Amino acid sequence: MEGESSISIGYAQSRVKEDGYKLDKNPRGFNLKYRYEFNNDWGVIGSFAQTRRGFEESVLIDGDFKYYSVTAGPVFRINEYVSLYGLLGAGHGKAKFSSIFGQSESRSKTSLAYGAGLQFNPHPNFVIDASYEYSKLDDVKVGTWMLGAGYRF
Ligand SMILES: O=S(=O)(O)OC[C@H]1O[C@@](COS(=O)(=O)O)(O[C@H]2O[C@H](COS(=O)(=O)O)[C@@H](OS(=O)(=O)O)[C@H](OS(=O)(=O)O)[C@H]2OS(=O)(=O)O)[C@@H](OS(=O)(=O)O)[C@@H]1OS(=O)(=O)O
Ligand SMILES: CCCCCCCCOCCOCCOCCOCCO
């Protein structure tokens, strides 16, 4: 009820699109969420997420794409089993390139990130968390799904 924290860790996967094309394969990573309930009805929740996809060519070129976000928002409990939340924060996207010819360069952008999710408590001490997040970084669109689990105490 009042003063309950929930901590969860989860898998995260992004679909990254620009101008009708999708980056292959999808960046993947993790999501950590921390929630604190002020009372039986309202609380706050914070989220960090990161997904990555690396690429290499050998016999030599390499690059990687990384997205991470920090978001937060109110979380409302419906009953003992289910709570819903919305999130707002910042997303940062980065594409980094390097070769044996000397090139080492990146492109990056920070913009708003928007999210929404829910937490399910099959028992009062457990959490299953699922959320979606979206960020537009210039003309690159990053949509991220997250599915996690953890504990409530
Ligand atoms: O270039 S440095 O000698 O300052 O060392 C910085 C290392 O962090 C990286 C990580 O990026 S990654 O390889 O893509 O994972 O860059 C990150 O940190 C820098 C430095 O910022 S700081 O607060 O002065 O230290 C940011 O660069 S800048 O904004 O200062 O110009 C980066 O921001 S940006 O993405 O280029 O917009 C930041 O990247 S990120 O936000 O973590 O994605 C690497 O620096 S980098 O290759 O120049 O980007 C360094 O890590 S590494 O494993 O040595 O490559
Ligand atoms: C894992 C997310 C990678 C997001 C990189 C975004 C870079 C921010 O702005 C760059 C805009 O132009 C750079 C083009 O880089 C291509 C990245 O998108 C690939 C989708 O096909």
TrEMBL record:
Localization per Swiss-Prot or TrEMBL: Cell outer membrane
InterPro entries membership: Bact_OM_Invasion-Related (IPR051723), Beta-barrel_OMP (IPR027385), Enterovir_OMP (IPR000758), OMP/PagP_B-barrel (IPR011250)
Superkingdom of origin organism: Bacteria
GO terms under cellular component: cell outer membrane; host outer membrane
Record's bilayer topology term: Multi-pass membrane protein
Annotated keywords: Membrane, Signal, Transmembrane, Transmembrane beta strand
Span of domain Outer membrane protein beta-barrel: 2-153
Coiled coil feature spans: none
One protein family per Pfam: OMP_b-brl
Designated name of the protein: Attachment invasion locus protein
Organism of derivation: Yersinia pestis
This protein's encoding gene: ail
